[PDB]
Amino acid sequence: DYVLYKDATKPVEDRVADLLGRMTLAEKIGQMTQIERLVATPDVLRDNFIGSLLSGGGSVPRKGATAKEWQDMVDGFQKACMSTRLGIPMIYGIDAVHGQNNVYGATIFPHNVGLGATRDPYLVKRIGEATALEVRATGIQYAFAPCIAVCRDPRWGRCYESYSEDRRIVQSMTELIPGLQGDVPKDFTSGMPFVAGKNKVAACAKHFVGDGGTVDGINENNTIINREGLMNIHMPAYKNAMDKGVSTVMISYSSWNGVKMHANQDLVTGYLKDTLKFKGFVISDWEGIDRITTPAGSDYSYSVKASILAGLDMIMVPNKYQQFISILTGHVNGGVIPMSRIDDAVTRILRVKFTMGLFENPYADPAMAEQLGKQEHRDLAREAARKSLVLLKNGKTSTDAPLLPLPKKAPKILVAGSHADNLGYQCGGWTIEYQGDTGRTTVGTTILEAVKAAVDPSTVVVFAENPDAEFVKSGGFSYAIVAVGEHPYTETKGDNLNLTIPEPGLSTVQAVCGGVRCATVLISGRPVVVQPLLAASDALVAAWLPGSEGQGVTDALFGDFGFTGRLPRTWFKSVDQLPMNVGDAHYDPLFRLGYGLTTNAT
Ligand SMILES: OC[C@H]1O[C@@H](S[C@H]2[C@H](O)[C@@H](O)[C@H](O)O[C@@H]2CO)[C@H](O)[C@@H](O)[C@@H]1O
Ligand SMILES: *[C@@H]1O[C@H](CO)[C@@H](O)[C@H](O)[C@H]1NC(C)=O
């Protein structure tokens, strides 16, 4: 009664081949199908031999769910999968792209653009490490991260998910990968997948390729650039990912010179697989195959043929699994898609599952639950937040006293602005909900809370969200901290041609700073029109989307640490200049990539 694939002491490739040789067409196509937990039931998982599940943004068992509730959900799905004839465990994926961010009480790290400002790849690794633990705390084995897009136009609604417009910074930050997955061994072959074990997670380098180079930063659009620019800008970090053993790669919605990435056999098979020698699995984006056609979904039969022939291994359906499975089955049965293509896709999927130890530990570890939101992880996020801040101005004239760092002791201070006490706003998109949200959406410390935690007990802290000029002038304030900026957004909702922050933002800064010396904290996913905020402010800090740990902000405002962050993107003078990147011809920045003022700790 020995079955070689169930034997944990055998080599991964022997286990993969042994299992593959036993599988029916239905079992094989099943591996290739990922479905939303929203459509999953025990019978659906068993009857369709489903290979993977995901939670999309905001797909949660319930609002407020505990780590254990997540574990019990995942384990209930796994129980169903393990009960099939072959008992192939599912892999569960989720967008843990700045911590385990769909989950209440999870540590929310700064978004990527802020992490780019740190120039600290070891920090990002340690964030990968903490994120894996917080993901495994919820029973989940697979994170759709890192986004290694090189955003070339900040009008893109996902620019905050890019570490930098400079491919070299992005390349340096692929250290997230061995943080999430573990360090590959001495003699590792570039392109092979790797995950250390049950305390780590499979990663996903996304979105292949040129997602950050789209015309006018239009999300999911066309990236018009020759092979040499594709390979010089958008590709390099994928090779770094191969060298670090990234387990999966997700394909972009975007097109390259008019060809849909989800149908690009030359790039997916010819380049990623045959040239970079990637041996993990390639996954679609969410209804990515549907979007091959215009309109989307209008020829699903073609979407399945084109994508699987292009070299995609797993399809994030994620809802219409019966139609996907029926169509791919028919294509195989009719000789349109050879068995060799199915066998390759399934080889890769199983290779990742076996390598990461999923057949040995298919179920959650309840002892890991307490990793969620752990104070050591918050301290890390707080460090990252502080390191991400870029000080853009610290004095209206070169002769003024520097405003920062501020003194912790003063009779009375003002904290103001729409973003001074709003956790959701300081977290941005991909936090609790897909699009993010407003207000106290999870566990954290707002800027106002951090000020109160930082200041001398004699210091009276006044909060006013949008005070008028008279209120400020009459307040007897020593100084003000005013926080304003962008509202949370994701993907196309963030595509923005004007890049001016919503009002009241500017008007609040003008009223505050017109009455008292002010430090303006700008919360944004990207450079936004900033000359008017600058002209009003004594000091101004670009804080990006710093996450749950607002004490990172006050750590630098009050001089516990000096400002060290440096712009990871060009700050434009005007949106009419865009696209404009470091190294262009017409390069006329307000602040060049690399700019950032410093302070010393007090
Ligand atoms: O979340 C998986 C995958 O998604 C796309 S966006 C996805 C949201 O998760 C889902 O809740 C919403 O209704 O649909 C959107 C896309 O239309 C994303 O490009 C990718 O990075 C992410 O890993
Ligand atoms: C780019 O966006 C326009 C709408 O702005 C749309 O008509 C077109 O199909 C898009 N192209 C691609 C390749 O996504």
Give a brief rundown of this model:
The protein has 21 helices and 17 strands. It is α/β, with parallel strands linked by helices and 602 residues long. It is globular.
Structure overview:
The protein has 602 residues and is of the alpha/beta class. It has two domains: 1-373, no CATH class; 374-559, no CATH class. It contains 21 helices and 17 strands. The chain has helices spanning 12-20, 25-31, 42-47, 67-82, 112-118, 121-136, 167-172, 176-181, 227-234, 236-243, 265-273, 300-310, 321-333, 339-355, 375-388, 423-427, 447-454, 469-474, 506-515, 531-536, 551-557, and strands at residues 33-36, 52-55, 91-94, 142-143, 204-208, 222-223, 248-251, 255-256, 259-260, 281-283, 315-316, 390-394, 412-416, 460-464, 480-485, 518-523, 539-544. The strands form four sheets. Strands 12-17-16-15-13-14 form a six-stranded mixed sheet, sandwiched between helices. It has a five-stranded parallel sheet with strand order 4-3-2-1-11. Strands 5-7-10 form a three-stranded parallel sheet. β15 (480-485), α19 and β16 form a beta-alpha-beta unit. It is globular. The protein starts with 11 loop residues before the first helix and ends in a 45-residue tail after the last helix. The structure holds a molecule of 2 linked components (SGC-BGC) and 2-acetamido-2-deoxy-beta-D-glucopyranose (NAG). A molecule of 2 linked components (SGC-BGC) binds at residues 56-58, 95, 144, 206, 285-286, 434, 491.
